[PDB]
């Protein structure tokens, strides 16, 4: 029988994972009324993530989804921007896109990353120092990656708040025409930005993406919009909630917080354990089969939705001992917070860099930081990205 996964799962997924993962390495479940296959064990997850039988095909997903809702033309630029990126395609097309996007990074762009992150972190902490209590998400965890990614991409400072707010609104849309409307505005904005960098190339990643070439091959206008969008959003709320979840873990384990403050040689290991323990993404993006596939000994039929639970794999006792415990001194190497295989997260070094600097700088500036509320007052967002509604902290 197909276990129904609802709002309780969304808010608190790891106890569901602990019960299904013991039963089999893959579970047949129903998520949002859609039957699908949930890969749970670490080995099975690595195999699924390297299995060419799992396809990124948003068009087939749409067609299959229409069938489960029993319902059955020109795509708007928003519609296209949402799905015409790296995570929306398979090789060879995926190989080409990611070859070109990797060329766009210049050495100057990469080197400015660390100085820029420490300057933004600095500015943000100067703006909250003196307040007794702040919501660390709105005051720090969300603005930092918004700024860093926006500056790397080339979004002007005066436009950054608005792009962030549109991203939040895209994230909470419930109806396709609404989502498409938000996306259409975003795509229109990114079309203007791209036009201005064609006319006057700067030292930003948009200009790098326009100029990248493989002989005469280049990113089309469509691919540019979709990739600039994905690069802006893929690390915005994901980095913020990594920082949020990690700071929450650190505050709920004050001995390790103090240990980390006293010994920065534990910082790298602390960021790794944050990704393993409570990653902002416990699920990867939806995949669809075209033919039967074999994952963890479980046969999955053709025309099936397949989702890989990075979180369940990261909490797999076959791979990590005492996996429900947060322990920065652990060997957390080999987690799947950034994926695995051809779609492995392109931004993983940047996400690690921002998180390491942000947490380090927080504990340096605010030695007496603590939760400002009782844990029973915290709430998780009703969202596939694992994140808190707020993180109230007393800076002291």
């Amino acid at each position: 029988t197909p276990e129904v996964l609802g709002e309780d799962f969304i808010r608190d997924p790891y106890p569901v994972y602990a019960r299904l993962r013991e039963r089999a390495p893959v579970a047949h479940v129903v998520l949002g009324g859609a039957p699908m296959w949930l890969v749970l064990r670490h080995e099975a997850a690595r195999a699924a993530l390297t299995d060419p039988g799992l396809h990124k095909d948003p068009e087939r997903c749409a067609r299959l989804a229409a069938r489960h809702a029993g319902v059955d033309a020109e795509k708007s630029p928003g519609q296209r921007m949402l799905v015409e990126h790296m995570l929306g395609m398979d090789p060879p097309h995926h190989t080409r896109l990611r070859k070109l996007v990797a060329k766009a990074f210049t050495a100057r762009q990469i080197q400015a990353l660390r100085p820029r992150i420490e300057h933004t972190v600095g500015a943000l902490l100067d703006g909250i120092a003196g307040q007794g209590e702040v919501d660390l998400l709105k005051a720090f965890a969300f603005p930092l990656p918004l700024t860093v990614i926006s500056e790397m991409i080339g979004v002007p400072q005066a436009d950054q708040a608005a792009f962030g707010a549109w991203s939040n609104a895209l994230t909470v849309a419930v109806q396709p025409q609404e989502m498409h409307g938000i996306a259409d505005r975003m795509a229109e904005y990114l079309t203007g930005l791209i036009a201005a960098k064609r006319a006057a190339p700067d030292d930003d990643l948009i200009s790098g993406l326009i100029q990248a070439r493989d002989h005469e091959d280049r990113l089309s206008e469509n691919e540019l919009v979709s990739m600039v969008f994905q690069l802006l959003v893929a690390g915005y709320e994901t980095t913020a909630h990594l920082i949020g979840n990690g700071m929450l873990a650190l505050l709920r384990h004050p001995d390790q917080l103090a240990a980390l403050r006293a010994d920065r040689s534990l910082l790298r290991g602390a960021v790794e354990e944050i990704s393993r323990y409570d990653n902002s993404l416990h699920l990867n993006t939806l995949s669809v089969t075209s033919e039967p596939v074999r994952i963890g000994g479980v046969r999955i039929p053709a025309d099936a939705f397949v989702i890989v639970s990075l979180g369940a794999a990261n909490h797999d006792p076959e791979r990590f001992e005492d996996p429900e415990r947060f322990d920065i001194r652990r060997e957390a190497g080999g987690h799947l917070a950034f994926g695995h295989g051809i779609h492995h997260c392109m931004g993983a070094p940047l996400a690690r860099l921002q998180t390491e600097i942000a947490v380090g700088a927080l504990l340096d500036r605010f030695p007496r930081i603590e939760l400002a509320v009782a844990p029973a007052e915290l709430r998780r967002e009703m969202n596939l990205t694992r994140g808190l509604e707020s993180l109230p902290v007393r800076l002291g």
């Binding site: 948003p58 997903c61 949402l82 990126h85 995570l87 895209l170 419930v174 993006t285 990205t385």
Partner: peptide, 10 residues
Amino acid sequence: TXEGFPXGYX
């Protein structure tokens, strides 16, 4: 959202 469906997640 980034496989073309409302409900966040891209």
